[PDB]
Design a protein around this ligand. Sequence first.
Ligand code: NAG
Lengths: 45, 49
Amino acid sequence: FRPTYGVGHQPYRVVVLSFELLHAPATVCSTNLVKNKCVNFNFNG
Amino acid sequence: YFKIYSKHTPINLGRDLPQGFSALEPLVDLPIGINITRFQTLLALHRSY
Ligand SMILES: *[C@@H]1O[C@H](CO)[C@@H](O)[C@H](O)[C@H]1NC(C)=O
């Protein structure tokens, strides 16, 4: 980890991300509100 | 989904499982799929009689 090293010898961080398609999913996923009038609601899906 | 349906009932009775209706309400849900083909109760009574 020297500053004089070139791009080949410079540190290139690697952080693995692997989304698993297993059986039990996670909630890895909002407007405001109206009071009294005809609207379309997606309340909790 | 390992759903735990819990309801405590502190009712008067001379013998267990008496008469009366008490609906079992859902308390805690677990969204983790595991193969539970066997079962035991962890009973750490210690103070037992
Ligand atoms: C264990 O449970 C999960 C969730 O229901 C299921 O997808 C999986 O196939 C089970 N494993 C086996 C092979 O029993």
